[PDB]
Structure 1
Amino acid sequence: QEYTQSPEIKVPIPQKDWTGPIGEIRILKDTTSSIARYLYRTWYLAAARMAAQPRTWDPLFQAIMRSQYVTARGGSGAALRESLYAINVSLPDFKGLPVKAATKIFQAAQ
């Protein structure tokens, strides 16, 4: 009941307003009649201002960002295990550890 709804876009962006793909994404023209221009400009300027920051490149800052998501709660590491087993790479089992394997800490250790 919660995951079966979808938005109803009464006025969608015209298809003749996106360029050819870059990577796999597309570029929205500047002549578009849609109001998405202002959202595009806001996000673009914010991204540029973020990129132009010395603290952004501080390796300690990067370490903080990387350690942020690591948590002692579950992270659905099972599907990770079947995926990595399918691509046939092998992870350490950590047999004999008296800790649960359903933690992102355990995932990071693997």
Structure 2
Amino acid sequence: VPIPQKDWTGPIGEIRILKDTTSSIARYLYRTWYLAAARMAAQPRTWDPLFQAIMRSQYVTARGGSGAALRESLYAINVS
């Protein structure tokens, strides 16, 4: 049972806002993620430079990352 196509707004870049008149159950999922994002972004620790540094360093590990594909992807736009 899919979400009706008549229940979306115009695009904002790539995203598309979901209306509130929808009969689908997706509305509650949208509301939950909405409130979650709002509460997340309001935390002052989010803007602390150390927190952002920790998040950046989290995925910097000694394990593989498919670097080769990265390399030709960058070469595709003439960057060495």
User: TM (normalized to structure 1)?
Assistant: 0.71
- Equivalent-residue separation in structure 2 for 1:20 and 1:28 (angstroms): 10
Q: Which has the higher helix share?
A: 2
Long gaps (5+) in structure 1: 1-10, 91-110
Identity, % of aligned positions = 100
Q: Which has the higher contact order (CA 8 A, sep 6+)?
A: 1
Q: What do the CA deviations read for 1:29-65 (whole angstroms, capped 9, x no partner)?
A: 0000000000000000000000001001000000000
Let me know the Cα RMSD of the aligned residues: 0.5
The count of corresponding residues between Structure 1 and Structure 2 is 80
Tell which structure's C-alpha radius of gyration is larger. Answer: 1
User: TM (normalized to structure 2)?
Assistant: 0.97
Q: CA deviation at 1:84?
A: 1.1
Q: Which has the higher strand share?
A: 2
* Runs of 4+ in structure 1 over 4 Å off: none
Long gaps (5+) in structure 2: none
